[PDB]
Amino acid sequence: DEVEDVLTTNRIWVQRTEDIGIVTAEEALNYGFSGVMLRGSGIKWDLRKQQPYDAYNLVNFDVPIGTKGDCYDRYLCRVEEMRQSLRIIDQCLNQMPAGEIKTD
């Protein structure tokens, strides 16, 4: 909250990030983009939800999607992945079973 109070609302950060480095979604698909650079351009694609692995499907979270595709949307997407990672950390601290740590 303190880091976002300094960085996110500022006019210099907006003028240095917004409408800069705009990548279209068909260029993102054709050039083989993955992750936040897919998610910042409006494409709803997170590998933790579509093809789940290693108990991501017993925990619940939100997938942040950008709109414009510039630097500001990707920065806000990274901060929202930070907060949803805090949510998944909360759920994993809430429930864990007692048992072995490795395969037998």
Partner: protein, 117 residues
Amino acid sequence: IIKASTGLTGLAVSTNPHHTLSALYGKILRAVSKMPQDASYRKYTEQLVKQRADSVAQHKDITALEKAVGCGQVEELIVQAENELILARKMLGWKPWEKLVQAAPAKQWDWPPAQIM
């Protein structure tokens, strides 16, 4: 009644999606009508684009068309139809319906490869 945005940059909204989809589907039929009838790709593309053309002609609303097709939003349907039109133009020259251009070499697809056998 119009979509404000697609939620997806690089693709603006379409003023007349139905006529663009119908024109692309008619051009796909015109490109596939030159294919031989024994080729299975012609039959599969004709079945696909006939089903999609019946879905476009049956539904006049945009979001009803997007729900009835079920693939996605209608601009991505225009993108898919354009890509399949480019494919149907290219596969007349690529000539896929014939036999194998190159036979299998000896021990080409054997794993593990170091065995005597």
